[PDB]
């Protein structure tokens, strides 16, 4: 298989590249856990619906127990079974509307062990869904130490994806994109500091130097050959770079968060391919804090489309 | 209390700036539970005598089970308990000539929740030991975001000090040296990125204006005033920059990994100070992989404790 051809398949399938951000935060799983009390439980429900809560490997048996039970029989899995929830009814509720989804790493590691169990059900969950996942992790180290990350991210997480950042040197994409032993080939997106709208105007440039090489190692793994790729994570408000590397690089895959204040039409725009998998739009508490989050990303999957429309031609 | 202080009283205790590395592979953790059965399980035994196994606070019930009870009444539970046991038997052989121990994220993370149990109670072993830590993460994200770094580093792992990729700003430091609601001040160490011997050699440099930076916002963030500082993660092998750095940040705290092939003598004096808690040298599979860890580790801090003696003077 491999991400460019999933990329691909989905971008043909529901035409958007609406990539949605699953950024759970303390108060998210409280505020869920609250109304979800005051709802009689509505959403939950709903989410022990679906095929797919049965193929998740972690602690399945607590997660398919009725909420009300599980509340009083088992108080050491409350957090747990809430936070793991949280997540199936944001995916639930929005799938439909997303290219890819993106997780990050953050978001799942201050609880210890607890939030790293949430992780892998929720990529479990999008995998089974077969939806394009992104670990936005930020993986930084020397080749020998990153192999740990490959293993965790692209073996045990099974994600099509991460975010790296190569500062130190772009020889770590070796170990991290490429396993020599399993002849097996991943995807990345490479941190590019690029200024914003202040320090743009304020007094090959570095990051072009650093793009190159990325694709240079990309070119020597032969990852695109092997349907993969390393990208670009472009802020949405560096318009001027977003244009240069769009323009410089004609078909390198961009991925684009911050628009949440942003302008959606400039950040796309700017970016814009007619191969859109290659801009992917990174919205996530806009959506997943919305208290309607299926109308919030029917309304971000609108506002994208009618700026692809516009850009295909106009 | 505070990091600074922390390091002043155990450097004038054992007079060394040795830095143990802990990062447990595979086939140390496989390696470990064969030759502990080959031994009659001779170190977990004296694990098994110290105070402090008692207050590790995840599955302590299982790590205080007999081994050979272990391996067929909970084979569910082997691997966590062969992990955590190995780290303990390096901590307990060879505790007394480190100044610090630092521990790579990376090694704790491939195997899902299972090695975030391990690693929390490693940093709580180290902890009752009065240890100074290092958790070697190279966390890096906008300042939100690296919130929940700061929670899981200094409040769940209860961490002296991490290290901090830089690249995309030094803004987020504020949110991972400083907690405002809590009015808790904590140590990092910067990566930054230097030439070794090849690079040197071929054709305000970048790494010291953000060098600057960082060290601005240690101030900034009345880090020192509060017996807490931003440092750099500088390579051992970056003999001018090692050199640059100590000599331009007269007082600035250098980490320095990589001499594990390296030339002690070398590293240790280009960067040199005489409070020397200021150049930790970590040393990590050089002891970790010797079959004899204990005596591995007083080769070291007697090395270290000779070029320290010559740079004293001479």
């Given at each position: ?76 899995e409350e957090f747990f079974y809430f936070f793991n929830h949280f997540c199936f009814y944001i995916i639930n509720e929005t799938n439909k509307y997303a ?191 919305n208290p309607y989050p299926q109308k919030a990303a029917q309304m971000y999957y609108d506002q994208i489309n009618a700026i692809l429309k516009q850009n295909?031609?106009?």
């Amino acid at each position: 298989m491999g991400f460019k051809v999933k990329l691909e398949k989905r971008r043909n399938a529901i035409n958007t590249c609406l990539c949605i951000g699953l950024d759970p935060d303390e108060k998210d799983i409280e505020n869920f856990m609250k109304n979800e009390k005051e709802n009689n439980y509505n959403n939950i429900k709903k989410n022990l619906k679906e095929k797919y809560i049965n193929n998740v490997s972690i602690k399945k048996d607590i997660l398919l127990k009725a909420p009300d039970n599980i509340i009083r029989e088992e108080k050491s899995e409350e957090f747990f079974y809430f936070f793991n929830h949280f997540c199936f009814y944001i995916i639930n509720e929005t799938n439909k509307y997303a290219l890819t989804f993106k997780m990050n790493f953050a978001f799942y590691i201050p609880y210890g062990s607890v939030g790293i169990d949430v992780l892998k059900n929720v990529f479990d969950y999008l995998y089974e869904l077969n939806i394009p996942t992104i670990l936005d992790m930020k993986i930084n180290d020397i080749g020998n130490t990153v192999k740990n990350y490959r293993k965790f991210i692209f073996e045990y997480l099974k994600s099509d994806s991460c975010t790296v950042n190569i500062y130190m040197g772009t020889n770590m994409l070796k170990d991290i994109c490429y396993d020599e032993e399993k002849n097996k080939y991943y995807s990345a997106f490479v941190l590019v500091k690029t200024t914003n709208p202040d320090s743009a105007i304020f007094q090959k440039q570095a990051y072009v130097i650093m793009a190159q090489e990325a694709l240079n190692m990309s070119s020597y793994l032969n990852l695109e050959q092997n349907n993969e790729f390393i990208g670009f994570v472009v802020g949405a408000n560096s318009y001027d770079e977003m244009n240069y590397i769009r323009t410089y690089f004609p078909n390198c895959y961009i991925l684009s968060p911050g628009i949440g204040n942003g302008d959606l039409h400039k950040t796309l725009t700017n970016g814009y391919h007619k191969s859109y998998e290659k801009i992917l739009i990174n919205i996530g508490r806009a959506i997943t804090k919305n208290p309607y989050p299926q109308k919030a990303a029917q309304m971000y999957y609108d506002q994208i489309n009618a700026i692809l429309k516009q850009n295909m031609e106009s």
